[PDB]
Amino acid sequence: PAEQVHLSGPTMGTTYNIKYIQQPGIADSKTLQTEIDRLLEEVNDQMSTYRKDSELSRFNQHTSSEPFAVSTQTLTVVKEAIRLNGLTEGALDVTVGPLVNLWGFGPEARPDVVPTDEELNARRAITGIEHLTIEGNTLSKDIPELYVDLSTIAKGWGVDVVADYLQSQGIENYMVEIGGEIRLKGLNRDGVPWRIAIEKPSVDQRSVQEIIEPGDYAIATSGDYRQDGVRYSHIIDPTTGRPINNRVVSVTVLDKSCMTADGLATGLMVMGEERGMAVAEANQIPVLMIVKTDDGFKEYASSSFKPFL
Ligand SMILES: Cc1cc2nc3c(=O)[nH]c(=O)nc-3n(C[C@H](O)[C@H](O)[C@H](O)COP(=O)(O)OP(=O)(O)OC[C@H]3O[C@@H](n4cnc5c(N)ncnc54)[C@H](O)[C@@H]3O)c2cc1C
Ligand SMILES: [Mg+2]
Ligand SMILES: [Mg+2]
Numbered sequence: 001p002a003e004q005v006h007l008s009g010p011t012m013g014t015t016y017n018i019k020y021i022q023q024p025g026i027a028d029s030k031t032l033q034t035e036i037d038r039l040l041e042e043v044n045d046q047m048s049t050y051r052k053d054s055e056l057s058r059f060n061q062h063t064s065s066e067p068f069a070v071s072t073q074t075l076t077v078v079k080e081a082i083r084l085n086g087l088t089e090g091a092l093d094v095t096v097g098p099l100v101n102l103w104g105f106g107p108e109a110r111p112d113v114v115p116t117d118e119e120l121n122a123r124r125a126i127t128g129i130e131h132l133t134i135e136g137n138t139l140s141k142d143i144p145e146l147y148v149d150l151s152t153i154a155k156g157w158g159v160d161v162v163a164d165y166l167q168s169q170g171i172e173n174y175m176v177e178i179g180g181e182i183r184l185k186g187l188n189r190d191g192v193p194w195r196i197a198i199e200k201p202s203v204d205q206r207s208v209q210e211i212i213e214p215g216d217y218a219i220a221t222s223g224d225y226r227q228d229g230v231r232y233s234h235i236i237d238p239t240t241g242r243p244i245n246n247r248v249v250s251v252t253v254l255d256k257s258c259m260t261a262d263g264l265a266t267g268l269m270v271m272g273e274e275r276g277m278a279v280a281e282a283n284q285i286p287v288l289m290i291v292k293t294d295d296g297f298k299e300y301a302s303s304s305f306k307p308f309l
Contacts, residue, residue: 002021002022002189002190002191003021003022003189004019004020004021004022004188004189005019005020005021005022005029006018006019007019007029007032007033007036009033009036009037009040011040011041011043011044011158011178012040012043012044012048012154012155012158012178012179013050013179014155014178014179015178015179016036016040016158016162016176016177016178016179017175017177018036018162018166018174018175018176018177019174019175019188019194020032020166020171020173020174020175021171021173021174021186021187021188021189023170023171023172023173025170026169026170026171027169032165032166032169032171035165036162036165039158039161039162039165040158040161040162040178042073043073043154043157043158043161046070046071046073046074046154047073047074047077047150047154047157049097049106049107049147049149049150049151050107055070055071055074056070056074056148056150059139059141059148060097060146060147060148062141063144064144065140065141065142066140067135067136067138067139067140068138068139068140068141069137069138070137070138070139072137073157073161074139075134075137075139076157076259077150077153077154077157077259078094078132078134078139078148078150079134080153080259080260080263081094081150081152081153081263082129082132082134084153084260084263084264084267085129085267087264087267087279087283088264088267088268088270088271088276088279089271089275089279090129090238090239091237091238091267091268091270091271091276092152092263092264092266092267092270093127093128093129093238094129094132094148094149094150094152094153095127095128095129095131095132095146095147095148095149096127096149096236096238097127097146097147097148097149098123098126098127098145098147099120099123099124099127099236099238099241099242100149100151100234100236101123101147102115102119102120102123103115103232103234103236103242103243105234106149106151120241120242121241123241124241126143126145126146126147127146127238127241128238131143131146132146132148151234152262152263152266152267153259153262153263154259155178155179155181155258155262156181156218156220156257156258156259156260156261156262156263157258157259157262158178159176159177159178159181159182159183159218159258159259159262160183160218160257160258160259162176162178162183163176163183163185163218163258166185167185172185172186173185173186173187173188174186175188175194176258180220180221181218181219181220181221181258181261181262182196182218182219182220182258183217183218183219183258184196184214184215184216184217184218184219185216186216192213193213193214193215194213194214195211195212195213196211196212196213196214196219197209197210197211197212198210198212198221198252198288199225199250200225200290200297200299201225201249201250201290201292201297202297203295203296203297210309212308212309213308214254214308216256217254217255217256218254218255218256218257218258218260218261219252219253219254219258219261220252220253220255220258220261220262220264220265221250221251221252221253221265222235222250222251222265222266222269223235223248223249223250223251223269223290224250225249225250225290230245231243231244231245235266235269235270236270237270238270244269244270246269246270246272246273247272247273247291247292247293248269248272248273248276248289248290248291249290249291249292249297250269250289250290251265251266251268251269251276251287251288251289251290252265252287252288252289253265253268253285253286253287254285254286254287254305254308255285255286264285264287268280268285268287268289269289273289273291273300276289277289277300277302280302280304280305281302281303284303284304285302285304286302286304286305286308287300287301287302287304287305288300288301288302288305
């Protein structure tokens with residue numbers, strides 16, 4: 001009878017949940033949790049916008065055009081952010097920091113008063129992926145006020161870092177989950193591939209879960225299924241400088257990398273269902289987008305997502 005261990009703790013303003021299947025010859029749960037906590041604290045010390053002395057915050061505080069050296073891990077995540085910026089036609093843009101902060105979703109204290117068009121325009125003027133370059137093991141910013149936010153991607157990165165640690169310890173059956181971003185390998189305590197739920201919105205407002213088995217894959221979801229006014233959310237449209245205003249309720253992406261799935265889910269959400277599903281089709285990305293229609297909801301699954309339903 002297979003023994004599942006559940007580890008939980010705090011990271012990145014949220015909680016992680018790791019489940020794995022005990023096998024002969026592996027480290028005890030205390031040993032594993034101790035290293036998992038160290039790895040995730042490192043991700044936070046590299047890439048947290050909320051820690052004033054993180055590598056990323058020190059880059060945000062840096063004012064020179066002069067190259068700023070960063071860790072291999074930060075470099076890997078920023079390179080992926082830039083790659084996914086190209087793939088999403090500019091939709092995923094980690095230099096939207098100033099706008100995320102303006103709207104109340106970052107470390108900056110904001111009032112309940114809506115920003116003026118003048119304040120918004122000032123923050124838009126100091127955003128844009130074009131301002132950020134990678135040179136060897138360094139970042140450079142061609143404007144001093146550039147503020148990079150890796151909230152959209154470094155969670156997936158932490159999931160990948162922990163998944164690789166569990167593999168390094170000879171654990172081949174696991175679920176790593178941080179703030180809802182997941183990576184799975186092998187089989188659950190019942191000997192079947194791990195089960196995740198996709199939340200479906202319903203016109204009757206009843207909670208509907210679809211349970212799928214992704215197999216050896218990462219899964220990331222952006223948006224929350226949960227009156228008709230101004231749209232206000234933490235996902236910013238880089239073209240408007242404002243919270244996204246489109247029909248997209250949620251986007252679920254599968255990828256071998258949780259980092260990659262995380263960036264893609266947010267990027268495709270900002271693109272909208274037409275341009276987003278077109279990118280998913282052209283690039284063999286398994287995606288499910290739920291969109292609000294005139295009198296209900298509709299799903300769009302890419303060709304590479306069809307199997308999983
Ligand atoms: C390393 C790390 C440390 C964190 N530490 C803290 C903490 O100390 N305290 C705390 O309260 N929260 C913390 N957070 C949480 C963070 O502020 C976000 O709330 C969270 O990461 C949102 O994740 P999500 O999966 O819901 O968002 P996703 O949908 O995956 O991405 C949305 C987030 O990305 C950013 N963003 C918005 N629009 C875009 C865009 N078009 N392109 C690119 N990025 C965009 C914004 O930060 C937004 O919240 C941390 C996150 C990370 C990754
Ligand atoms: Mg994301
Ligand atoms: Mg995310």
